[PDB]
Subunit: 114 residues, 4 copies
């Protein structure tokens, strides 16, 4: 099943933050309405934040996270969680190799902001 794709409410600001846990350099691309709106790159085996940004979901509200490591897309796992029917988390884990810890690049999308 498709992972890393989320439908947010339209024209809504949301935060996107990426963490790295891998010997491999992580490149995280955040697409909004099918266009790259943010790119974070970094290498850490210590959950370092390799990037954070606030984006607008645009008219489509379509947000997609892609993670690439050593020239190959990482396998993605994701889910959206909603707390108290108001607070949203779009979560992404990714696996760049074979140990399947899926934390190589961890991406958290959260909204609403403000």
């Amino acid at each position: 099943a498709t992972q890393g794709v989320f439908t947010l409410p339209a024209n809504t600001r949301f935060g996107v933050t990426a963490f790295a846990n891998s010997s491999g350099t992580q490149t995280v691309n955040v697409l909004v309405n099918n266009e790259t709106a943010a790119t974070f790159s970094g290498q850490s085996t210590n959950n370092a934040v390799i990037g954070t940004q606030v984006l607008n979901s645009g008219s489509s509200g379509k947000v997609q996270v892609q993670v690439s490591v050593n020239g190959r897309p990482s396998d993605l796992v994701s889910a959206q969680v909603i707390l108290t029917n108001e607070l949203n988390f779009a979560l992404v884990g990714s696996e760049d190799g074979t140990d399947n810890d899926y934390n190589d690049a961890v991406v958290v999308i959260n909204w609403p902001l403000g």
Copy 2:
């Protein structure tokens, strides 16, 4: 129900990151085995990542997130989600006012790291 309390596997590194979205100055305290292990604070209505740190769950694996704003504990909401039976996110939202967006201080705990 109690919120903001999570049982992690013992002696396990986890990341804890806080985001602020409120005119109110947020103060986030992270307790491990009931002892403060990290404290973050900030004032942003634009999802500033006011703090991130790597902690160890210790022998108890007990982790608790507390949030206060100008001397008042905020109301918390939380849940834990596990993806592909490997990646864990312990999520916390908090409300310091009356609009109930519960994003005033948002805390994300993730493990495993590395």
Copy 3:
């Protein structure tokens, strides 16, 4: 924070199922548009399905779950999770006593159906 309240898409069919795990007889009320649309009662310490129905979210999409034992409201905990940006689960747990297992009445709402 308010729990057991979910905003589903309007006029959408959804399933609501309740399980009991308590010495006490559970009463589960499912409210749509603030009106009781389904009610289940029963006692089991073996996860019996005391009720499962398909209801339509109506024009507002507002769905609320209430759990009480012989008239005494139980404490609720809830969250919503969406898988592959399509499959929705609204989850409710409830505590009617002191042990805090919050499984006295467990309610799961899922959509889309069909």
Copy 4:
């Protein structure tokens, strides 16, 4: 990533319930310790419970859900959610066709029971 596989606490009772939403007859196999522990079969386009049972996670605590329609394995999506650090839901969605509503066979695993 693998889906439908969950690690429950060892030797713990849990409930597993399957709902069907498809013209195809759904077969859900629940394995514990990699051995079939339960199997449900039914057809419904109205979220009917095609099976519900209480099982024990056994020594490994490993529980896997597999879904097949017409002898073909459905694609699965899943996640585990924990509320108030006590109540667990291991959720599974499955797709037997091309519309990708992933609700053809929905399986809900919950614990603790009692």
